[PDB]
């Protein structure tokens, strides 16, 4: 009934042998297995992992009836932590795994596809298991969209969301929506021992490498690159089917293996964002190998509102730059977020970059070990099956008052904290805000204070608490917590 840190992928490998569909994940796991095992050992030496209940866990990949990376890293983490995993990837496997006053599973990891299938399967008993769902939703689901009646009342047209879960049951690829939990993935290193001793030998050159494998992504960026070029060589890894948009002076390497790319990143001073693709791993991989990242700034920020790429998403989350995580959670000196319309700002950033030495940096949360700490913490401390939650600890709460036009998400972030939605239920009374009157409302923007009238508005619907949302007129009362540098998902007391 207690859980045992596994270090032998044999049992796993036979589990993942049972479908061709799993081959790509098998290969990923096999490749990283040494890193994965050093990780679980290393964690078990800095953390007592000896006192944990073995949990029976469904995982259902509707996807199989980016993602597969996260699935790989999740499934692997569940194994190394010693839990009893039932992988399903078909209606029949799911239907079999399911069909006294007990529960047949304690955790369920699933994607949006699988959730429709899970619901259709369990029918009425849905409710007996919904507190256990952990929904892999890369782009996230904001409370305004999760909550069906309210979405309808706001006239939202997207068929997505409307599941009425606790929004912390949504698991995202990057920490962009603090209404949801951050699961993430591991940024792979393709370097063995001989490469490590060789990684040293590589002398870094005053040369740039452009981010983008496709000629399309380069379109109308000549002015931007010409500024880079002024000061350093410009290398690419572009699939050269067409080169219509590639300046003549670009030194193309073509598509490289992960191994070869990492060696190239080691002789590169600057990795250059073109503005697409949005929040991918490549810039983390660059920063890890000691490159700086030139991060195009978005004015206005891009969202489901103004960008065809995001239309229909059940979230109004905005991108302030091509890589908001790199912008907010790494920043200078490693990351230089700059407006491409501001030619002077770009030139300055490039001049500044060329005159600083910066050490490599991989955030703890995007390693095998950080991921294991992070998932272990969610499994051991995050329970929705016993009503209102007590983790993270209330000791972590630090209230801020967002000014009109500012979300709780922003006010916490701008003060180097993260909005913690589980603290919202404790902001129910005024005990620099004193009310002369209060009312109840079912709105994502409350609790709110009107400092003109000294009128407070409290949340009347537990499912409408939102880190997301700004009041045009009023101040929002906001629950923030501290977080660990490199491990945003946790606070210091979160232990
Ligand atoms: C890389 O550049 C370092 C600093 O560069 C300086 O500023 C740029 C804008 C130019 O003015 C450049 O000539 C200056 O040195 C140098 O200290 C260093 O030698 C260079 N390293 C390599 C690998 O070439
Ligand atoms: C590292 O990988 C390369 C590339 O295939 C291989 O030839 C080399 O022998 C490896 N070195 C070690 C120490 O595993």
Short mmCIF file of C-alpha atoms and ligand atoms in Angstrom, two decimals:
data_model
loop_
_atom_site.label_atom_id
_atom_site.label_comp_id
_atom_site.label_asym_id
_atom_site.label_seq_id
_atom_site.Cartn_x
_atom_site.Cartn_y
_atom_site.Cartn_z
CA UNK A 1 0.00 0.00 0.00
CA UNK A 2 3.18 2.22 0.20
CA UNK A 3 4.97 3.45 -3.01
CA UNK A 4 8.47 2.35 -4.17
CA UNK A 5 10.78 4.55 -6.37
CA UNK A 6 11.30 2.31 -9.48
CA UNK A 7 14.69 2.50 -11.36
CA UNK A 8 14.03 -0.32 -14.00
CA UNK A 9 12.01 0.65 -17.15
CA UNK A 10 11.44 -3.07 -17.95
CA UNK A 11 7.85 -3.25 -16.48
CA UNK A 12 7.05 0.10 -18.17
CA UNK A 13 8.52 -1.05 -21.54
CA UNK A 14 6.19 -4.12 -21.61
CA UNK A 15 3.22 -1.78 -20.73
CA UNK A 16 4.19 0.46 -23.72
CA UNK A 17 4.88 -2.56 -26.03
CA UNK A 18 1.08 -3.23 -26.16
CA UNK A 19 0.36 -0.65 -28.96
CA UNK A 20 2.30 0.54 -32.05
CA UNK A 21 0.79 3.98 -31.19
CA UNK A 22 3.18 4.06 -28.14
CA UNK A 23 6.35 3.46 -30.25
CA UNK A 24 7.30 7.21 -30.48
CA UNK A 25 6.92 7.53 -26.66
CA UNK A 26 8.83 4.25 -25.96
CA UNK A 27 11.74 5.66 -28.09
CA UNK A 28 11.69 9.04 -26.24
CA UNK A 29 11.69 7.24 -22.85
CA UNK A 30 14.44 4.76 -23.87
CA UNK A 31 16.59 7.70 -25.11
CA UNK A 32 16.22 9.68 -21.80
CA UNK A 33 16.08 6.67 -19.37
CA UNK A 34 19.62 7.32 -17.86
CA UNK A 35 18.74 10.99 -17.21
CA UNK A 36 15.31 9.87 -15.78
CA UNK A 37 16.92 7.33 -13.37
CA UNK A 38 19.73 9.69 -12.16
CA UNK A 39 16.84 12.15 -11.54
CA UNK A 40 14.62 9.88 -9.34
CA UNK A 41 17.79 8.81 -7.38
CA UNK A 42 18.91 12.45 -7.00
CA UNK A 43 15.41 13.57 -5.76
CA UNK A 44 15.23 10.63 -3.25
CA UNK A 45 18.55 11.89 -1.72
CA UNK A 46 17.38 15.55 -1.31
CA UNK A 47 13.70 14.61 -0.44
CA UNK A 48 12.21 11.78 1.74
CA UNK A 49 10.10 9.98 -0.99
CA UNK A 50 9.70 6.90 1.31
CA UNK A 51 6.35 7.66 3.06
CA UNK A 52 3.82 7.78 0.13
CA UNK A 53 0.73 5.61 -0.62
CA UNK A 54 0.88 3.66 -3.93
CA UNK A 55 -2.04 5.15 -5.99
CA UNK A 56 -4.03 3.26 -8.68
CA UNK A 57 -4.02 5.66 -11.68
CA UNK A 58 -5.94 5.62 -14.99
CA UNK A 59 -4.31 7.41 -17.93
CA UNK A 60 -6.48 7.60 -21.09
CA UNK A 61 -5.07 9.10 -24.34
CA UNK A 62 -8.11 10.09 -26.48
CA UNK A 63 -5.37 11.62 -28.72
CA UNK A 64 -4.63 7.96 -29.83
CA UNK A 65 -8.32 6.94 -30.52
CA UNK A 66 4.13 18.33 -28.16
CA UNK A 67 1.33 16.45 -26.37
CA UNK A 68 3.14 13.06 -26.73
CA UNK A 69 6.26 14.67 -25.13
CA UNK A 70 4.24 15.70 -22.04
CA UNK A 71 2.42 12.30 -21.97
CA UNK A 72 5.84 10.54 -22.19
CA UNK A 73 7.28 12.64 -19.32
CA UNK A 74 4.08 12.28 -17.24
CA UNK A 75 3.68 8.49 -17.71
CA UNK A 76 7.42 8.09 -16.91
CA UNK A 77 7.17 10.26 -13.74
CA UNK A 78 4.16 8.19 -12.52
CA UNK A 79 6.30 5.00 -12.91
CA UNK A 80 9.56 6.22 -11.25
CA UNK A 81 7.36 7.46 -8.28
CA UNK A 82 5.99 3.90 -7.87
CA UNK A 83 2.26 4.24 -8.67
CA UNK A 84 -0.02 1.53 -10.16
CA UNK A 85 -0.66 2.87 -13.72
CA UNK A 86 -3.44 1.54 -16.01
CA UNK A 87 -2.76 3.00 -19.51
CA UNK A 88 -5.80 3.00 -21.82
CA UNK A 89 -5.77 4.40 -25.44
CA UNK A 90 -9.17 3.07 -26.74
CA UNK A 91 -12.89 3.08 -25.65
CA UNK A 92 -12.55 -0.72 -25.01
CA UNK A 93 -9.45 -0.34 -22.73
CA UNK A 94 -11.19 2.54 -20.83
CA UNK A 95 -14.61 0.71 -20.75
CA UNK A 96 -12.77 -2.45 -19.43
CA UNK A 97 -10.63 -0.52 -16.84
CA UNK A 98 -13.93 0.92 -15.37
CA UNK A 99 -17.14 -1.24 -15.84
CA UNK A 100 -18.94 -1.57 -3.10
CA UNK A 101 -18.90 2.12 -1.83
CA UNK A 102 -15.14 2.20 -2.86
CA UNK A 103 -13.38 3.82 -5.87
CA UNK A 104 -11.65 1.70 -8.58
CA UNK A 105 -9.02 4.46 -9.18
CA UNK A 106 -7.60 7.45 -7.19
CA UNK A 107 -6.22 9.58 -10.09
CA UNK A 108 -7.22 9.97 -13.77
CA UNK A 109 -4.96 11.77 -16.25
CA UNK A 110 -6.73 12.52 -19.52
CA UNK A 111 -6.94 15.04 -22.40
CA UNK A 112 -9.98 16.99 -23.71
CA UNK A 113 -10.86 14.26 -26.32
CA UNK A 114 -10.68 11.61 -23.57
CA UNK A 115 -12.92 13.61 -21.22
CA UNK A 116 -15.85 13.43 -23.75
CA UNK A 117 -15.20 9.67 -24.01
CA UNK A 118 -14.81 9.29 -20.18
CA UNK A 119 -18.16 11.11 -19.63
CA UNK A 120 -19.95 9.03 -22.32
CA UNK A 121 -18.52 5.88 -20.60
CA UNK A 122 -19.29 6.49 -16.87
CA UNK A 123 -22.69 8.22 -17.61
CA UNK A 124 -24.30 9.05 -14.19
CA UNK A 125 -21.30 7.89 -12.03
CA UNK A 126 -19.23 10.64 -13.78
CA UNK A 127 -19.68 12.65 -10.50
CA UNK A 128 -18.18 9.75 -8.40
CA UNK A 129 -14.80 10.30 -10.23
CA UNK A 130 -14.76 13.93 -11.53
CA UNK A 131 -12.68 15.22 -8.49
CA UNK A 132 -9.87 12.84 -9.69
CA UNK A 133 -9.63 14.15 -13.29
CA UNK A 134 -6.34 15.90 -14.26
CA UNK A 135 -6.94 17.22 -17.77
CA UNK A 136 -3.93 17.73 -20.07
CA UNK A 137 -4.96 21.02 -21.74
CA UNK A 138 -1.81 22.63 -23.27
CA UNK A 139 -3.34 26.11 -23.86
CA UNK A 140 -5.43 26.10 -20.62
CA UNK A 141 -9.11 26.71 -19.74
CA UNK A 142 -10.05 29.98 -17.93
CA UNK A 143 -12.90 29.85 -15.35
CA UNK A 144 -15.17 32.10 -17.52
CA UNK A 145 -15.06 29.27 -20.18
CA UNK A 146 -14.97 26.21 -17.80
CA UNK A 147 -18.31 27.39 -16.27
CA UNK A 148 -21.10 26.56 -18.79
CA UNK A 149 -24.03 28.78 -17.59
CA UNK A 150 -21.67 31.84 -17.32
CA UNK A 151 -20.02 31.30 -20.73
CA UNK A 152 -23.55 31.07 -22.25
CA UNK A 153 -24.54 34.25 -20.26
CA UNK A 154 -21.43 36.08 -21.67
CA UNK A 155 -22.50 34.89 -25.19
CA UNK A 156 -19.21 32.90 -25.78
CA UNK A 157 -19.58 30.92 -29.06
CA UNK A 158 -16.68 28.38 -28.60
CA UNK A 159 -17.88 24.75 -28.20
CA UNK A 160 -14.83 24.21 -25.90
CA UNK A 161 -14.79 24.39 -22.03
CA UNK A 162 -18.15 24.01 -20.19
CA UNK A 163 -16.91 21.03 -18.01
CA UNK A 164 -17.58 22.89 -14.72
CA UNK A 165 -14.47 21.39 -13.00
CA UNK A 166 -12.22 23.09 -10.48
CA UNK A 167 -9.96 24.92 -13.03
CA UNK A 168 -6.81 23.65 -11.17
CA UNK A 169 -7.74 20.20 -12.64
CA UNK A 170 -6.51 21.64 -16.03
CA UNK A 171 -2.76 20.88 -16.62
CA UNK A 172 -0.91 23.24 -19.02
CA UNK A 173 2.32 22.99 -21.08
CA UNK A 174 3.71 26.33 -19.73
CA UNK A 175 2.76 28.35 -16.61
CA UNK A 176 0.66 31.00 -18.50
CA UNK A 177 -2.74 30.56 -16.67
CA UNK A 178 -2.48 30.41 -12.84
CA UNK A 179 -6.21 29.41 -12.75
CA UNK A 180 -4.85 26.03 -14.00
CA UNK A 181 -2.00 23.81 -12.72
CA UNK A 182 1.37 23.81 -14.61
CA UNK A 183 2.44 20.22 -15.59
CA UNK A 184 4.99 21.05 -18.34
CA UNK A 185 7.50 18.61 -19.86
CA UNK A 186 11.30 17.96 -19.91
CA UNK A 187 13.54 19.75 -22.47
CA UNK A 188 15.77 16.78 -23.62
CA UNK A 189 19.63 17.08 -23.72
CA UNK A 190 21.07 14.83 -26.53
CA UNK A 191 24.58 14.87 -24.87
CA UNK A 192 26.34 11.72 -23.42
CA UNK A 193 29.72 11.87 -21.45
CA UNK A 194 32.05 12.27 -24.54
CA UNK A 195 29.76 15.17 -25.74
CA UNK A 196 29.92 16.83 -22.24
CA UNK A 197 33.80 16.87 -22.33
CA UNK A 198 33.41 17.97 -26.05
CA UNK A 199 30.65 20.62 -25.15
CA UNK A 200 33.57 22.38 -23.27
CA UNK A 201 35.89 22.36 -26.33
CA UNK A 202 33.30 24.40 -28.45
CA UNK A 203 34.37 28.13 -28.51
CA UNK A 204 31.30 30.50 -28.73
CA UNK A 205 31.42 32.81 -31.80
CA UNK A 206 29.89 36.31 -32.27
CA UNK A 207 27.25 34.65 -34.52
CA UNK A 208 23.44 34.48 -34.43
CA UNK A 209 21.11 31.51 -35.16
CA UNK A 210 17.53 32.24 -36.35
CA UNK A 211 14.58 30.34 -34.75
CA UNK A 212 12.37 28.93 -37.56
CA UNK A 213 12.58 25.74 -39.69
CA UNK A 214 10.18 27.13 -42.36
CA UNK A 215 10.74 29.94 -44.96
CA UNK A 216 7.13 31.23 -44.29
CA UNK A 217 8.12 32.18 -40.67
CA UNK A 218 10.91 34.46 -42.13
CA UNK A 219 8.43 36.51 -44.28
CA UNK A 220 8.91 40.35 -44.11
CA UNK A 221 11.75 40.31 -41.44
CA UNK A 222 14.62 41.68 -43.65
CA UNK A 223 14.97 44.93 -41.59
CA UNK A 224 15.18 42.96 -38.26
CA UNK A 225 17.86 40.52 -39.55
CA UNK A 226 19.80 43.32 -41.35
CA UNK A 227 20.34 44.89 -37.84
CA UNK A 228 21.55 41.49 -36.44
CA UNK A 229 23.72 41.04 -39.62
CA UNK A 230 25.26 44.52 -39.13
CA UNK A 231 26.96 43.01 -35.99
CA UNK A 232 27.20 39.19 -36.50
CA UNK A 233 26.85 36.29 -38.99
CA UNK A 234 23.29 34.89 -39.32
CA UNK A 235 22.93 31.06 -39.32
CA UNK A 236 19.69 29.11 -40.00
CA UNK A 237 18.42 25.53 -39.73
CA UNK A 238 15.77 25.86 -42.48
CA UNK A 239 14.32 23.03 -44.66
CA UNK A 240 15.36 24.59 -47.97
CA UNK A 241 12.38 23.54 -50.12
CA UNK A 242 11.87 27.34 -50.60
CA UNK A 243 14.25 30.15 -49.53
CA UNK A 244 12.14 33.06 -51.04
CA UNK A 245 12.25 34.82 -47.60
CA UNK A 246 15.89 33.95 -46.63
CA UNK A 247 18.42 36.79 -47.05
CA UNK A 248 21.40 35.85 -49.29
CA UNK A 249 23.86 36.33 -46.38
CA UNK A 250 22.21 33.63 -44.16
CA UNK A 251 24.50 30.57 -43.53
CA UNK A 252 21.90 27.71 -43.67
CA UNK A 253 22.86 24.40 -41.90
CA UNK A 254 19.49 22.84 -42.84
CA UNK A 255 17.54 20.73 -40.27
CA UNK A 256 19.92 19.22 -37.65
CA UNK A 257 19.61 16.28 -35.25
CA UNK A 258 19.02 17.42 -31.61
CA UNK A 259 22.64 16.44 -30.84
CA UNK A 260 24.16 18.52 -33.71
CA UNK A 261 21.76 21.45 -33.01
CA UNK A 262 23.00 21.57 -29.37
CA UNK A 263 26.67 21.76 -30.56
CA UNK A 264 25.58 24.57 -32.93
CA UNK A 265 23.87 26.37 -30.01
CA UNK A 266 27.19 26.12 -28.09
CA UNK A 267 29.03 28.17 -30.79
CA UNK A 268 26.09 30.66 -31.02
CA UNK A 269 25.90 34.00 -29.07
CA UNK A 270 22.26 34.87 -29.96
CA UNK A 271 19.17 32.73 -30.89
CA UNK A 272 16.80 35.01 -32.87
CA UNK A 273 12.97 34.84 -32.49
CA UNK A 274 10.99 35.87 -35.64
CA UNK A 275 7.70 35.98 -33.59
CA UNK A 276 6.46 32.47 -34.52
CA UNK A 277 6.27 29.80 -33.28
CA UNK A 278 4.68 30.80 -29.91
CA UNK A 279 6.09 29.49 -26.56
CA UNK A 280 7.91 26.34 -27.82
CA UNK A 281 10.91 24.54 -26.24
CA UNK A 282 13.67 25.62 -28.75
CA UNK A 283 14.43 28.89 -26.89
CA UNK A 284 14.81 26.97 -23.57
CA UNK A 285 17.24 24.64 -25.40
CA UNK A 286 19.17 27.75 -26.62
CA UNK A 287 19.31 29.45 -23.14
CA UNK A 288 20.39 26.05 -21.63
CA UNK A 289 23.40 25.89 -24.06
CA UNK A 290 24.33 29.52 -23.07
CA UNK A 291 22.73 31.48 -25.97
CA UNK A 292 20.73 34.66 -25.40
CA UNK A 293 17.18 34.70 -26.85
CA UNK A 294 15.94 37.75 -28.82
CA UNK A 295 12.17 37.63 -27.91
CA UNK A 296 9.85 39.64 -30.23
CA UNK A 297 7.43 41.76 -28.09
CA UNK A 298 3.65 41.84 -29.06
CA UNK A 299 1.85 45.29 -29.19
CA UNK A 300 -0.97 44.63 -28.95
CA UNK A 301 -0.51 41.26 -27.18
CA UNK A 302 -1.92 38.31 -29.20
CA UNK A 303 -4.97 36.35 -27.82
CA UNK A 304 -7.94 34.17 -28.90
CA UNK A 305 -9.40 37.65 -29.67
CA UNK A 306 -7.02 39.11 -32.35
CA UNK A 307 -5.08 36.05 -33.74
CA UNK A 308 -6.61 33.26 -35.96
CA UNK A 309 -4.16 30.71 -34.30
CA UNK A 310 -6.04 31.07 -30.92
CA UNK A 311 -9.69 31.61 -32.15
CA UNK A 312 -12.14 29.26 -30.30
CA UNK A 313 -9.76 28.42 -27.38
CA UNK A 314 -11.71 28.47 -24.05
CA UNK A 315 -9.32 31.18 -22.69
CA UNK A 316 -8.62 34.90 -23.35
CA UNK A 317 -4.96 34.46 -22.30
CA UNK A 318 -2.67 36.95 -24.12
CA UNK A 319 0.92 36.53 -25.37
CA UNK A 320 2.99 39.67 -24.55
CA UNK A 321 5.90 38.21 -26.64
CA UNK A 322 6.78 35.11 -28.77
CA UNK A 323 7.92 33.41 -25.48
CA UNK A 324 6.11 34.87 -22.46
CA UNK A 325 7.61 32.24 -20.07
CA UNK A 326 11.12 33.28 -21.26
CA UNK A 327 10.03 36.97 -20.97
CA UNK A 328 8.48 36.76 -17.42
CA UNK A 329 10.38 33.89 -15.70
CA UNK A 330 13.92 34.21 -17.25
CA UNK A 331 14.31 37.85 -18.51
CA UNK A 332 17.65 39.76 -18.90
CA UNK A 333 20.43 39.01 -19.30
CA UNK A 334 19.49 35.66 -20.97
CA UNK A 335 16.29 36.94 -22.70
CA UNK A 336 15.92 40.34 -24.45
CA UNK A 337 12.23 41.07 -25.22
CA UNK A 338 12.15 43.85 -27.90
CA UNK A 339 9.66 45.58 -30.25
CA UNK A 340 10.74 44.73 -33.85
CA UNK A 341 9.13 48.08 -34.96
CA UNK A 342 11.69 49.77 -32.67
CA UNK A 343 14.88 49.42 -34.80
CA UNK A 344 16.86 51.45 -32.14
CA UNK A 345 15.71 49.10 -29.27
CA UNK A 346 16.79 46.03 -31.36
CA UNK A 347 20.23 47.51 -32.21
CA UNK A 348 20.72 48.36 -28.50
CA UNK A 349 19.75 44.83 -27.36
CA UNK A 350 22.13 43.33 -29.98
CA UNK A 351 25.04 45.71 -28.95
CA UNK A 352 24.30 44.96 -25.24
CA UNK A 353 24.15 41.12 -25.83
CA UNK A 354 27.50 41.07 -27.74
CA UNK A 355 29.20 42.83 -24.73
CA UNK A 356 27.94 40.40 -21.98
CA UNK A 357 29.12 36.86 -21.07
CA UNK A 358 26.13 34.82 -19.72
CA UNK A 359 26.27 31.26 -18.28
CA UNK A 360 23.91 28.50 -19.54
CA UNK A 361 20.56 28.16 -17.69
CA UNK A 362 17.88 25.42 -17.78
CA UNK A 363 15.01 26.18 -15.35
CA UNK A 364 14.71 23.41 -12.69
CA UNK A 365 11.06 22.80 -13.67
CA UNK A 366 12.01 21.70 -17.30
CA UNK A 367 14.50 18.97 -16.11
CA UNK A 368 13.65 15.29 -15.27
CA UNK A 369 14.30 16.04 -11.52
CA UNK A 370 12.20 19.26 -11.28
CA UNK A 371 9.30 17.59 -13.16
CA UNK A 372 9.44 14.62 -10.73
CA UNK A 373 9.35 16.99 -7.68
CA UNK A 374 6.45 18.93 -9.32
CA UNK A 375 4.30 15.86 -10.23
CA UNK A 376 5.09 14.14 -6.86
CA UNK A 377 3.84 17.32 -5.09
CA UNK A 378 0.54 17.38 -7.15
CA UNK A 379 -0.08 13.66 -6.42
CA UNK A 380 0.73 13.98 -2.67
CA UNK A 381 -0.78 17.44 -1.87
CA UNK A 382 -3.52 18.26 -4.49
CA UNK A 383 -6.87 16.59 -3.51
CA UNK A 384 -10.30 17.86 -4.76
CA UNK A 385 -12.22 14.74 -3.49
CA UNK A 386 -12.67 16.16 0.11
CA UNK A 387 -14.26 19.57 -0.81
CA UNK A 388 -12.39 22.91 -0.40
CA UNK A 389 -8.54 22.38 -0.56
CA UNK A 390 -5.90 23.30 2.19
CA UNK A 391 -2.81 23.13 -0.13
CA UNK A 392 -1.04 25.36 -0.78
CA UNK A 393 -0.89 26.47 2.88
CA UNK A 394 -2.79 29.69 3.83
CA UNK A 395 0.51 30.92 5.38
CA UNK A 396 1.59 31.61 1.71
CA UNK A 397 -1.23 34.09 0.95
CA UNK A 398 -0.18 37.69 0.22
CA UNK A 399 -3.16 39.88 -0.84
CA UNK A 400 -2.66 42.56 -3.52
CA UNK A 401 -5.25 45.06 -4.89
CA UNK A 402 -5.14 45.12 -8.72
CA UNK A 403 -5.87 48.67 -10.03
CA UNK A 404 -8.72 49.14 -12.59
CA UNK A 405 -7.79 47.50 -15.94
CA UNK A 406 -5.33 45.04 -14.23
CA UNK A 407 -6.05 41.26 -13.69
CA UNK A 408 -5.12 39.38 -10.47
CA UNK A 409 -2.83 37.39 -12.82
CA UNK A 410 -0.86 40.64 -13.67
CA UNK A 411 -0.82 42.24 -10.19
CA UNK A 412 0.77 39.09 -8.65
CA UNK A 413 3.21 38.56 -11.59
CA UNK A 414 4.27 42.26 -11.79
CA UNK A 415 5.15 41.88 -8.03
CA UNK A 416 7.15 38.66 -8.74
CA UNK A 417 4.38 36.41 -7.23
CA UNK A 418 1.81 34.03 -8.77
CA UNK A 419 -2.00 34.30 -8.39
CA UNK A 420 -3.17 31.31 -6.26
CA UNK A 421 -6.86 30.54 -6.99
CA UNK A 422 -7.31 28.18 -3.93
CA UNK A 423 -6.91 31.26 -1.60
CA UNK A 424 -9.91 33.07 -3.30
CA UNK A 425 -12.45 31.34 -0.95
CA UNK A 426 -10.72 33.08 2.07
CA UNK A 427 -11.31 36.57 0.51
CA UNK A 428 -14.97 36.70 1.65
CA UNK A 429 -14.87 39.79 4.02
CA UNK A 430 -13.00 43.19 4.29
CA UNK A 431 -11.22 42.05 7.57
CA UNK A 432 -6.26 49.60 2.74
CA UNK A 433 -9.90 48.43 1.86
CA UNK A 434 -12.91 49.02 4.27
CA UNK A 435 -16.48 48.61 2.86
CA UNK A 436 -19.35 50.93 3.79
CA UNK A 437 -21.63 48.46 1.90
CA UNK A 438 -21.22 44.99 0.37
CA UNK A 439 -23.17 42.82 -2.11
CA UNK A 440 -22.92 39.31 -3.64
CA UNK A 441 -22.38 38.77 -7.33
CA UNK A 442 -21.60 35.83 -9.65
CA UNK A 443 -18.85 37.44 -11.74
CA UNK A 444 -15.21 36.46 -12.48
CA UNK A 445 -14.07 40.05 -11.48
CA UNK A 446 -15.05 39.80 -7.75
CA UNK A 447 -14.12 40.16 -5.00
CA UNK A 448 -13.89 43.83 -6.16
CA UNK A 449 -13.67 47.20 -4.29
CA UNK A 450 -15.03 50.52 -5.70
CA UNK A 451 -12.76 53.04 -3.89
CA UNK A 452 -15.04 55.99 -5.00
CA UNK A 453 -18.13 54.55 -3.13
CA UNK A 454 -16.22 52.24 -0.64
CA UNK A 455 -18.61 49.44 -1.90
CA UNK A 456 -17.25 45.81 -1.82
CA UNK A 457 -18.60 43.00 -4.03
CA UNK A 458 -17.99 39.36 -2.97
CA UNK A 459 -18.14 36.19 -5.12
CA UNK A 460 -21.50 34.37 -4.90
CA UNK A 461 -20.37 31.44 -7.17
CA UNK A 462 -17.35 29.31 -6.01
CA UNK A 463 -16.72 28.21 -9.61
CA UNK A 464 -16.36 31.81 -10.94
CA UNK A 465 -13.19 32.76 -8.96
CA UNK A 466 -10.68 33.90 -11.68
CA UNK A 467 -6.98 35.03 -11.60
CA UNK A 468 -7.89 36.16 -15.13
CA UNK A 469 -10.03 39.27 -15.76
CA UNK A 470 -9.53 43.05 -15.16
CA UNK A 471 -12.26 45.44 -13.87
CA UNK A 472 -12.61 48.60 -16.05
CA UNK A 473 -13.73 50.78 -13.04
CA UNK A 474 -12.99 48.87 -9.77
CA UNK A 475 -9.97 47.31 -7.97
CA UNK A 476 -9.85 43.48 -7.71
CA UNK A 477 -8.81 41.91 -4.37
CA UNK A 478 -6.22 39.29 -5.44
CA UNK A 479 -4.77 36.22 -3.73
CA UNK A 480 -1.01 35.90 -4.56
CA UNK A 481 1.58 33.40 -3.27
CA UNK A 482 5.41 33.33 -3.44
CA UNK A 483 6.87 30.70 -5.81
CA UNK A 484 10.28 28.95 -6.13
CA UNK A 485 12.62 30.32 -8.86
CA UNK A 486 12.76 27.47 -11.42
CA UNK A 487 9.68 25.77 -9.77
CA UNK A 488 6.75 28.26 -10.14
CA UNK A 489 4.11 25.55 -9.39
CA UNK A 490 5.30 25.47 -5.70
CA UNK A 491 5.73 28.06 -2.89
CA UNK A 492 8.42 27.73 -0.10
CA UNK A 493 6.00 26.29 2.60
CA UNK A 494 4.47 23.96 -0.14
CA UNK A 495 7.26 21.53 1.08
C1 LIG B 1 32.84 39.22 -29.54
O1 LIG B 1 32.60 40.60 -29.27
C2 LIG B 1 33.21 41.01 -28.05
C3 LIG B 1 32.63 42.36 -27.70
O2 LIG B 1 32.34 43.09 -28.90
C4 LIG B 1 32.25 44.43 -29.07
O3 LIG B 1 31.13 45.25 -29.49
C5 LIG B 1 30.69 44.96 -30.81
C6 LIG B 1 29.44 45.75 -31.15
C7 LIG B 1 31.89 45.30 -31.68
O4 LIG B 1 32.15 46.69 -31.46
C8 LIG B 1 33.10 44.42 -31.33
O5 LIG B 1 34.15 44.63 -32.28
C9 LIG B 1 33.53 44.67 -29.88
O6 LIG B 1 34.64 43.85 -29.38
C10 LIG B 1 34.74 41.02 -28.20
O7 LIG B 1 35.38 41.49 -26.98
C11 LIG B 1 35.21 39.62 -28.61
O8 LIG B 1 36.50 39.72 -29.21
C12 LIG B 1 34.33 38.93 -29.66
N1 LIG B 1 34.37 37.47 -29.61
C13 LIG B 1 34.49 36.73 -30.72
C14 LIG B 1 34.30 35.25 -30.52
O9 LIG B 1 34.70 37.20 -31.84
C1 LIG B 2 27.89 9.72 -27.75
O1 LIG B 2 27.07 9.62 -28.94
C2 LIG B 2 27.80 9.48 -30.19
C3 LIG B 2 26.94 9.75 -31.46
O2 LIG B 2 26.37 8.58 -32.08
C4 LIG B 2 28.52 8.12 -30.14
O3 LIG B 2 29.20 7.79 -31.36
C5 LIG B 2 29.52 8.18 -28.98
O4 LIG B 2 30.26 6.95 -28.90
C6 LIG B 2 28.78 8.46 -27.67
N1 LIG B 2 29.65 8.58 -26.51
C7 LIG B 2 29.31 8.07 -25.30
C8 LIG B 2 30.22 8.30 -24.13
O5 LIG B 2 28.27 7.45 -25.09
#
